[PDB]
Symmetry: C3
Subunit: 139 residues, 3 copies
């Protein structure tokens, strides 16, 4: 059985950002040499996400607005997690909505994706070095 | 290592629908011949879901009402994704709540499920041909 | 190919509870003897979750408050699922937010986790025996 592992690192300019990581995953799959298998890609931090959706700026804006509605950043005081000086309680909630991980089929050496599937890193508490894990198993 | 792949296609009569796909997955598992492994089942479209929950009509109604509360279809104008004539922004949000995928253990040639687990395709922007992927790896 | 399976059982004192199960998963991984692979851990019941986040009491409180906002338990009458005497409709919704499952990479005989990742059983309709499945495949 083959396995492959890679950490992808991010340090976003702002607190929140969506980053299309599809091409990075494509290169992981390619270098793994795995023909058939499963790929896991997950945020290694509990204030960020890996998810699949559209790469369209309007929709990215809509996710920002929606996540702020469902899990508002402010006031910081509304969250007990922030009681001793942290301010990232909302990021733990936002990541929960978008999800921690994707699992993607590898078929004939490629990610087995639909026409509009793109993989994103969803940063909700950035401006510091954070990590995504790619793990592939198969043959 | 064995692997198995199947696309399951749907064309729903209405915009939104839940479809119990458990029996289809059972037939995938059976024909794969895999005894022990992991099964991924995911929506290949970014406006639909695969999830596990109850097959009970009251609950299906409750999910419809709840998803409309969390991610209302209308007005279309509230979403920037819809600015150039699409109207499916809400479906990208609804699918995010329900999830893209399930991963299910295969044990002794069967899906390793609890007593009430049923697998659903959650269509949020239907009336067109859309796809679910089943991928199984193991031995 | 190696595979490993274990059911972990819970019977919570109260309706809702978060339980850190990370050490149990560590022991599964250890006893499996698997060096490289993927671990699935999922709630086998459709009113509970397995998820990864912080083990911090303030945040646990915040999740409780947030989930009650997004998917209120009461009044029971607001949910059609509860129409014939059940009262757990909200638990099916809450679990949907937190998620059914985690998938975790196994690397060099260990769960491949970031610095603050902890795995939780999220019980939303407890006080009865319920189950989590751990399944590991790899070599
Ligand atoms: Na935090
Ligand atoms: Na769209
Ligand atoms: Na129920």
């Amino acid at each position: 059985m083959k396995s492959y592992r890679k950490e992808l690192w991010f340090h976003t300019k702002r607190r929140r950002e969506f980053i299309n990581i599809t091409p990075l995953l494509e290169e992981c799959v390619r270098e793994s040499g795995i023909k058939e298998g499963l790929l896991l890609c997950n945020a290694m931090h509990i204030t960020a996400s890996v998810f699949i959706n559209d790469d369209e700026p309007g929709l990215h804006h809509d996710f920002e607005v929606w996540l702020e509605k469902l899990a508002p950043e402010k006031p910081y005081s509304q969250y007990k997690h922030n009681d001793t000086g942290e301010d990232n309680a909302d990021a733990h909630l936002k990541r929960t909505i978008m999800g921690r991980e994707v699992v993607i089929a590898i078929t004939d050496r490629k990610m087995d994706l639909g026409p509009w599937e793109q993989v994103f890193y969803g940063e909700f508490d950035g401006m510091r070095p954070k990590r995504v894990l790619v793990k592939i198993i198969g043959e």
